[PDB]
Design a protein around this nucleic acid. Structure first.
Lengths: 158, 623, 203
RNA sequence: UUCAUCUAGACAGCCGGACGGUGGCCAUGGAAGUCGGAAUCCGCUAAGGAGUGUGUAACAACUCACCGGCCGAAUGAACUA
């Protein structure tokens, strides 16, 4: 009755490769197939994204719980078409996300982030969205960060 | 123990002598000998603690009752303590006799401790105590000693180890003796009794019980006993034993199953995971003495279970072995015993494959030497997969052009009017280069086709760059203006089309499966990074740290890949070389600085042809 | 001049914190990690403010501030070592309780004075049986069961106040046991012109 | 010679923090600060560079820039002849 937590990163929206799933799961004796479709069912809407999945392994069953990351939540803010790895090589994520969406994913990320305020956590999310390349209301995430820093963009603390 | 001084010992025999002086039995003795074992000599009390209530460390029981006799006898007789030799002798109940009293030093150690601990009692006692008998061994081992239906009657006979059941043997190796070539069949009688003159079915590895391939219902001349080097005939031999026999030699190749029942299948014809990887080109120094080389190659293939003799595509005799050790020993045996002729060893010269990747820039024109007929064509590369299909036989040159065109167009994406109008394939009547007709205004499309096919066969068996075969070239005949006149025209026309379609060379590419540990993957990745190794992928099983890499590797670096890889990684890695496919190269044959130019120039200096790479200028017919 | 500006703003921050907040905690931050500081501030968000810097600028600000506030002269002989301050106005008992509650264990190091008793329990290691030589060298009884190492009993390795050595520290690293704990240690408390230690707080 | 750091205490030395989004955008047979191109962003303080090197199949791990504790008068860089 030893609950073990296994952090694995598989491609969302697809069944994970059995060779990649083998070394961390095989000594624990679970079926690589079954943990594959469990991770796929947990990550249906994360299609084309390397997403961290925590496997709660306890008594020969593994529960696949998605650990939400900033890049994954920003791409599932973009709602871009699913990533085809083979053909295009330098996809610049040029979709537009809005401030209410960055507020709502900050509210989702409130349980793990170490920022004091929602403004600071949204600044972190804007930095991650800048690392991805996303434009926020047709404006630069940088410029929006200094807007909130100067206080021109008031963020509701609820 | 040690075989050099001829001795062995076990705590089981030390228990056999310690039982009477301590009152405790064998198993519990050795339980207080291995592990956390300690004994207290101040109160005579065995305990699981290195120290006591007072706390000075004690020493282990394995060190006080066993290694302490060994240590003190070493110290006394190496440092010449004759005041300590006889008292230790009588304490350890050794007895000396005569000269063995008179010995001193290393030979004294030899004799007194050969009298103390012979190797026989120990090594013999383990191999009979714990090491398995054939009944239990086959009772859990019956399903890999037979590849097929595991519920068969012969298999339950194997699992029960019946001496008078259906006779099956497995000739495992074709063992060499001093019979001037004629060997003996070293094999194990798992079931049945082999007799001198018994009609037994010789089954080859390719044999299946529903066919006739490599199956010989033949009698045995003689059955012989094996004791390492001598030869001794035996009448009969029962199940579970390994015996030699002669008479199977002229019918069986290398290894083979030997059954008496038609229902019984073959067994596992080895697994190796070693494979013949390193390859050398053998030829003669005497063409008159070449028959002895061919007989010697056949005999060497019979002799060593992992040697492989086969012909190349360029004609040399490729001998394939596992390593440089194994090749050099097989070659010395072949040169001195199997053939008896001085040979020559060479690198395995590779057949390369000339291939264009472009459409021809300008129209390919050639004319008859009598100047009556002209030919206009183009040359274009063919897709890799569809050429593989042609070479695999989906696209077979003997079918009806209609249904071929249907498959070619619907699955592979071609122009179907052409695909019905397909003319021919080369080389060898089955190759992937094909000639296609586009001409619509030519009246006589019947008196040219046979000459077209014939000298396309000639061009594709001898292309224009360095006189070697072609691949994945489609020849669009666009126009002809109308065998002594047509054959040179299409020779020059295919030549001009190739050289105007910008040729390159395909080099062969191996797929290698390397079994390796996760602490030697770094060395293997370093070796593949030395030599252009595009590893396809990365597999393993989870229970073991053994880890397989499937990889693409070229041949000009595979010449010496095996030694370099094992030098860098130790003997940790094991390769499985099988030929994958043909891959393209990215250099121009006309440029001698590049790889393609170097390899074509090396081929021209090897074959003694003209030095330059000929082109569309002198393979063109202008006004 | 940027260094001059940041230390001027540090002096201004110390002035406003000293005037705003009535009670002070002088805390040692010996061997405490930056992330642990982040969760200390997360637990003290909107509660009490943590300020630290170099004790030389602290001392210079205090003896420049002695003109109007002379009780920080009593606070002067205690700014020694890795010292931070937390400014507060709510009671010192649960200020100390939160500060000593936020603790994170750290792996043992070779030659290090053990603060508490180090015990290795009869817990299944999950390691291959090649480390039984190390276990027998350190005296821990282990048995190879189901193909893995099992610790038979509970063994004390290092006594309290003794130096953890190299083999014991390597065994703790291999077993992923972290007996060394590191956290903020309240060494002095200032309230209403008086200085008195956390022992008097614990009274 | 020029510029910078300096009793609001530097330079060196000893001790130990050297975090997070992050296996950052890609590229991946494989690249987590350290094969490669482009971004070189702040959350918070004492600070942490999408990382200065060693290392790994990639990880792990070691060590720097930066930073704090002891410390008590000058030294750090680039040039010139």
């Amino acid at each position: 009755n030893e609950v073990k937590y296994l952090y694995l990163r598989a491609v969302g929206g697809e069944v994970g490769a059995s060779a990649a799933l083998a070394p961390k799961i095989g000594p624990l004796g679970l079926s690589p197939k079954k943990v594959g479709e469990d991770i796929a069912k947990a990550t249906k809407e994360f299609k084309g994204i390397k997403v961290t999945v925590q496997l709660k392994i306890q008594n020969r069953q593994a529960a696949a719980s998605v650990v939400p990351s900033a890049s994954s939540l920003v791409i599932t803010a973009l709602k871009e078409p699913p990533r085809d790895r083979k053909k295009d090589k330098n996809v610049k994520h040029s979709g537009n996300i809005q401030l209410d969406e960055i507020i709502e994913i900050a509210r989702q990320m409130r349980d793990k982030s170490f920022g004091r305020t929602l403004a600071s956590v949204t600044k972190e999310i804007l930095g991650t969205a800048q690392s991805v390349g996303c434009r926020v209301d047709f404006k630069n995430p940088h410029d929006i960060i200094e807007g909130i820093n100067a206080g021109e963009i008031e963020i509701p603390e609820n | 123990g040690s075989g050099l001084h001829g001795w062995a010992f076990t705590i089981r025999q030390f228990a056999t002598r310690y039982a009477k002086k301590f009152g405790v039995d064998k198993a519990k003795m050795m339980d207080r000998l291995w592990g956390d074992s300690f004994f207290n000599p101040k109160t005579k009390k065995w305990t699981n603690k290195d120290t006591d209530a007072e706390g000075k460390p004690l020493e282990r029981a394995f060190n006080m009752f066993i290694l302490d006799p060994i240590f003190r006898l070493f110290t006394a007789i190496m440092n010449f303590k004759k005041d300590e030799i006889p008292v230790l002798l009588e304490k350890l109940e050794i007895v000396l006799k005569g000269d063995e009293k008179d010995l001193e030093g290393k030979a004294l150690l030899k004799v007194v401790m050969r009298k103390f601990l012979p190797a026989a009692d120990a090594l013999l006692e383990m191999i009979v105590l714990h090491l398995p008998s054939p009944v239990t061994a086959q009772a859990y081992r019956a399903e890999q000693l037979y590849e097929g239906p595991a519920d068969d009657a012969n298999c339950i006979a194997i699992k029960n180890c019946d001496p008078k059941a259906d006779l099956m043997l497995y000739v495992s190796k074709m063992v060499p003796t001093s019979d001037k070539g004629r060997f003996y069949a070293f094999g194990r009688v798992f079931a049945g009794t082999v007799k001198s003159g018994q009609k037994v079915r010789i089954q080859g590895p390719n044999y299946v019980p529903g066919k006739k391939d490599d199956l010989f219902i033949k009698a045995i001349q003689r059955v012989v006993l094996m004791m390492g080097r001598f030869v001794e005939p035996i009448d009969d031999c029962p199940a579970g034993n390994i015996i030699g026999l002669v008479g199977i030699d002229q019918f069986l190749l290398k290894t083979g199953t030997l059954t008496t029942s038609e229902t019984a299948h073959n067994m596992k014809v080895m697994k190796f995971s070693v494979s013949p990887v390193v390859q050398v080109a053998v030829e003669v120094k005497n063409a008159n003495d070449l028959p002895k080389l061919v007989e010697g190659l056949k005999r060497l293939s019979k002799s060593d279970p992992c040697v492989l003799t086969y012909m190349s595509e360029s004609g040399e005799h490729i001998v394939a072995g596992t390593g440089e050790l194994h090749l050099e020993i097989c070659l010395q045996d072949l040169e001195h015993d199997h053939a008896g002729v001085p040979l020559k060893i060479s690198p395995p010269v590779v057949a390369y494959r000339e291939t264009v990747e472009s459409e021809s820039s300008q129209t390919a024109l050639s004319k008859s030497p009598n100047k009556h007929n002209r030919i206009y064509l183009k040359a274009e590369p063919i897709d890799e997969e569809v050429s593989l299909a042609i070479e695999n036989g989906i696209i077979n040159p003997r079918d009806d052009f209609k249904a071929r065109a249907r498959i070619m167009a619907d699955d592979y994406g071609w122009d179907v009017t052409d695909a019905r109008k397909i003319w021919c394939f080369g080389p060898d009547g089955n190759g992937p280069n094909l000639v296609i007709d586009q001409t619509k205004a030519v009246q006589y499309l019947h008196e040219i086709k046979d000459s077209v096919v014939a000298a396309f066969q000639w061009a594709t068996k001898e292309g224009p760059i360095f006189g070697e075969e072609m691949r994945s070239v489609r020849v669009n005949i666009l126009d002809v203006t109308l065998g002594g006149q047509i054959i040179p025209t299409m020779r020059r026309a295919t030549y001009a089309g190739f050289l105007l379609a910008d040729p390159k060379i395909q080099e062969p590419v191996f797929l290698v499966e390397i079994q390796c540990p996760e602490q030697a993957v770094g060395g293997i990745y370093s070796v593949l990074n030395k030599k252009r190794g595009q590893v396809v992928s990365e597999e393993q099983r989870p229970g073991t740290p053994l880890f397989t890499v499937k990889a693409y590797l070229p041949v000009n670096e595979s010449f010496g890949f095996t030694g370099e890889l094992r030098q860098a990684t130790g003997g940790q890695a094991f390769p499985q070389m099988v030929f994958d496919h043909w891959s393209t190269l990215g250099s121009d044959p006309l440029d001698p600085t590049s790889k393609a130019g170097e390899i074509v120039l090396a081929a021209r200096k090897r074959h003694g042809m003209k030095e330059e790479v000929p082109g569309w200028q002198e393979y063109y017919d202008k006004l | 001049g940027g260094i001059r500006e940041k230390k001027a703003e540090y002096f201004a921050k110390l002035r406003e914190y000293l005037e705003e907040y009535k009670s002070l905690f002088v805390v040692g931050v010996d061997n405490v990690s930056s992330q642990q500081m982040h969760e200390v501030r997360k637990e003290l968000r909107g509660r009490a403010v943590v300020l630290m810097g170099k004790n030389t600028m602290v001392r210079r600000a205090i003896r420049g501030f002695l003109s109007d506030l002379p009780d920080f002269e009593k606070l002067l002989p205690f700014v020694k070592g890795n010292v931070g301050f937390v400014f507060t106005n709510e009671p010192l008992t649960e200020i100390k309780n939160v500060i000593v509650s936020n603790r994170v264990a750290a792996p043992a190091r070779a030659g290090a004075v053990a603060p508490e008793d180090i015990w290795v329990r009869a817990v299944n290691t999950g390691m291959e049986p090649g480390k039984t030589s190390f276990f027998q060298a350190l005296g821990v009884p282990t048995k190879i069961a189901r193909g893995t190492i099992e610790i038979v009993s509970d063994v004390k390795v290092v006594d309290a106040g003794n130096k953890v050595g190299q083999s014991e520290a390597s065994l703790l690293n291999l077993l992923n046991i972290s007996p060394f704990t590191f956290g903020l240690t309240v060494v002095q408390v200032y309230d209403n012109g008086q200085v008195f230690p956390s022992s008097i707080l614990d009274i």
